Amino acid sequence: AKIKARDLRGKKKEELLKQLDDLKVELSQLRVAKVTGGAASKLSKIRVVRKSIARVLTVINQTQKENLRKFYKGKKYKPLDLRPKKTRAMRRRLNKHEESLKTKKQQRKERLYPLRKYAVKA
């Protein structure tokens, strides 16, 4: 009766939706049993069903977002949620290409007068 993500990874989307619907129906029945006295065995299944629902929804969301970012992999413009989210300042940071960019004057200076290795007392 245990629901594991390993089996849910390969299942089709419609099967996962049907499993989610069945779990939600079971959770509603468990709530009805809870408010009508019920039993300890029935009441302990509420957490199990809630965690199964969470697992199914997590698998659905992870698969959907992986496919979506696969689709946008290569496009210049991507949805904001798919963009990397490091920090407010780090996204305003330079592109790492302009930092290495050097003007012709700087390249001329470095090429003409490079820093050389030397030793003394000999």
Binding site: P84, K85, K86
Partner: protein, 86 residues
């Protein structure tokens, strides 16, 4: 008359609950808080009351987003990667 008799006619309230700071300081007629200054964009604070600043500062609340930032920096702000699968 100015004492016990006057306290009888305290019938209508002048302050309500502010929706930005949560304190019962929102002035109804002036539409201003005076604890945080809700209509003003900037929060109300002063250096002549350090205890008031300590009561409502960064460390007092949940820190729901900043606590994750601390650990993410502590590991290196890595994004879009997973540990080696078993």
């Amino acid at each position: 008359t100015k004492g016990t008799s006057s306290f009888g006619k305290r019938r209508n309230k002048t302050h309500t609950l502010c929706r930005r700071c949560g304190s019962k300081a929102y002035h109804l007629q002036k539409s201003t808080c005076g604890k945080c200054g809700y209509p003003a964009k900037r929060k109300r604070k002063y250096n002549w009351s350090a205890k008031a600043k300590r009561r409502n500062t960064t460390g007092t609340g949940r820190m729901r987003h900043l606590k994750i930032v601390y650990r993410r920096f502590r590991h290196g702000f890595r994004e879009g990667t997973t540990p080696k699968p078993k």
